[PDB]
């Protein structure tokens, strides 16, 4: 059947982005936190009072691997970016900048998951109305057919975000300009900043529209 094909891919499609959110990978955090223990995990508390974001507590272990779940658990790449982030924090005048970096990182991830088990509630709870003969195949097809487009929304900004985190990771490394900590602050948060942010503020605001 047409309705029960849709309705089955789009369940197929969250469970295969649920499992990528977990660490299948026998991935390991370092001792200094891929050097962020003392510099990007250090400067937040947990957000999702609360313990510190680089201390041992379970809670923080949980947050910390929501970045490296954004970061598709890419030992390398994570090495990299939080090598960038202790070049930053060498400099007090940059901690806001890496705040709102990770922030910004740490805001996208939380929110795909979420965005994730949202979209799957929903299904169910249609299919139960179009069970209950409250909504026809119309209506059920026309809701799961809104809910695969926030689904690919939420994957594309999440990507979006990951994108940018690719090409600041590519440029600190071979811009040689990019070593004196002031100067790729400046150049980080005129490129990248808003971009990341707003990645964020779009995985957020798919997912208030799911609810």
Not at 57 to 81: C, G, H, S, V, W
């Amino acid at each position: 059947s047409k309705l029960q094909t849709l309705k089955n891919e789009l369940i197929r499609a969250i469970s295969e982005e649920k499992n990528k959110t977990q660490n299948n990978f026998g991935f390991r955090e370092t001792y200094d936190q891929f050097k962020m223990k003392d510099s990007a995990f250090e400067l937040l508390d947990v957000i999702s009072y609360a313990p510190q974001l680089n201390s041992n507590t379970p809670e923080a272990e949980n947050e910390r691997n929501k970045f490296y779940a954004l970061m598709d658990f890419d030992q390398y790449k994570i090495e990299q970016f939080g090598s960038i982030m202790e070049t930053l924090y060498n400099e007090n005048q940059n901690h806001s900048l890496i705040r709102e970096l990770m922030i910004s990182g740490l805001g996208t991830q939380i929110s795909f998951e979420l965005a994730l088990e949202e979209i799957n509630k929903k299904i169910e709870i249609f299919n139960q109305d179009y069970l209950n003969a409250k909504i026809n195949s119309f209506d059920f097809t026309m809701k799961l057919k809104e809910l695969k487009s926030k689904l690919n929304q939420i994957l594309d900004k999440r990507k979006e975000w990951s994108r940018q985190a690719d090409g600041l990771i590519a440029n600190a490394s071979s811009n040689s300009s990019l070593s004196d900590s002031k100067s790729l602050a400046e150049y980080i948060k005129k490129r990248y900043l808003d971009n990341m942010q707003n990645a964020r503020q779009s995985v957020l605001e798919a997912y208030i529209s799911i609810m």
